[PDB]
Amino acid sequence: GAMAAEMDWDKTVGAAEDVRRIFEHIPAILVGLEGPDHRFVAVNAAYRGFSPLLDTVGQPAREVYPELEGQQIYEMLDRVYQTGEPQSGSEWRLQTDYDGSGVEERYFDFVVTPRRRADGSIEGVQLIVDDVTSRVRARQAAEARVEELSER
Amino acid sequence: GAMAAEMDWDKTVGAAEDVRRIFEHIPAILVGLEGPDHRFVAVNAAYRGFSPLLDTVGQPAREVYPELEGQQIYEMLDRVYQTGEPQSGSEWRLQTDYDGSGVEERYFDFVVTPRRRADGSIEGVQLIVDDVTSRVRARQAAEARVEELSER
Numbered sequence: 572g573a574m575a576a577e578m579d580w581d582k583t584v585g586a587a588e589d590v591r592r593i594f595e596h597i598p599a600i601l602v603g604l605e606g607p608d609h610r611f612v613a614v615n616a617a618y619r620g621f622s623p624l625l626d627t628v629g630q631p632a633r634e635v636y637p638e639l640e641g642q643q644i645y646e647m648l649d650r651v652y653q654t655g656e657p658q659s660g661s662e663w664r665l666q667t668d669y670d671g672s673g674v675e676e677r678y679f680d681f682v683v684t685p686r687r688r689a690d691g692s693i694e695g696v697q698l699i700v701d702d703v704t705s706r707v708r709a710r711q712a713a714e715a716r717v718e719e720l721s722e723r
Numbered sequence: 724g725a726m727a728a729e730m731d732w733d734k735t736v737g738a739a740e741d742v743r744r745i746f747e748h749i750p751a752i753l754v755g756l757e758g759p760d761h762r763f764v765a766v767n768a769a770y771r772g773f774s775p776l777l778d779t780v781g782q783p784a785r786e787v788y789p790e791l792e793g794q795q796i797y798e799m800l801d802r803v804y805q806t807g808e809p810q811s812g813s814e815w816r817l818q819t820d821y822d823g824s825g826v827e828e829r830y831f832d833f834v835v836t837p838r839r840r841a842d843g844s845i846e847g848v849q850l851i852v853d854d855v856t857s858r859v860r861a862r863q864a865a866e867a868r869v870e871e872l873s874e875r
């Protein structure tokens with residue numbers, strides 16, 4: 572059959588206002604960024620609940636979490652934006668100020684992909700993030716316990 | 724300070740067209756459902772790629788995956804929609820036809836939450852889903868391997 576005509580977004584994805592309300596309430600940290608400076612363009616309630624430091628969308632990510640410039644993150648995002656090669660991480664240990672209580676260590680699982688405009692050029696990136704800090708800490712505590720029982 | 728006025732969605736979440744584009748391309752299976760019949764209202768490329776059986780949004784989920792009526796799923800969704808109590812699952816083993824190749828077993832991690840309208844009443848639910856079938860099968864194969872090495 573002939574190649575499919577342009578996507579009918581309303582039918583295939585959902586109406587824009589509905590999709591925004593659902594995105595806002597998806598029970599996972601979701602983030603969309605745009606342009607070569609990785610400006611926040613979409614963030615949901617989960618994101619803002621875990622990291623309430625972001626005011627309105629629009630800022631380059633580096634201005635919100637500058638310490639991550641020492642931890643490969645913006646170099647990584649650049650690569651995705653430039654080459655289109657997606658990336659993921661399992662339990663990446665990162666240190667920055669997430670909620671205004673001070674710099675701290677958190678662990679993250681994530682997947683990041685590029686986003687293309689109609690002509691095929693990359694306009695930004697988006698990610699799912701899982702804050703696994705408490706789960707890593709629980710695993711560590713459980714290991715400490717079995718270590719202690721086995722030693723005594 | 725006074726209570727905050729109504730959310731400025733454009734500034735807090737993102738512009739509706741932008742947010743829909745980002746939702747569509749989030750590297751995770753995302754699904755929003757509306758009303759007491761759990762009608763699909765938002766689905767992304769990841770969802771449609773893993774389960775290409777859905778045509779346009781709008782159908783009750785039960786019509787697409789009817790077998791799951793034998794596997795607690797619609798009773799679970801009803802509970803979330805009725806009571807507002809969110810639910811999650813780790814490696815739930817479910818059998819239905821996901822891609823038109825026939826009924827098969829898949830394993831899922833998920834989180835499902837309700838979605839409220841302005842007056843506080845629940846208008847639907849939404850979920851993140853992680854298809855963990857291949858990871859469960861890999862774990863099983865690795866266990867079978869250590870079992871066999873230890874037995875010989």
Ligand SMILES: CCCCCCCCCCCCCCCC(=O)O
Nearest residue numbers: 621622632636644669679681700702
């Ligand atoms: C924030 C820049 C995007 C880079 C994505 C790499 C994955 C690490 C996520 C760290 C960003 C801040 C974490 C936000 C939510 C949280 O602390 O759980």
Ligand SMILES: CCCCCCCCCCCCCCCC(=O)O
Nearest residue numbers: 752773774784796821831833852854
């Ligand atoms: C399909 C709507 C019901 C949602 C209820 C529980 C979510 C876990 C079960 C997901 C079943 C559909 C899976 C589609 C994507 C895939 O097969 O990876």
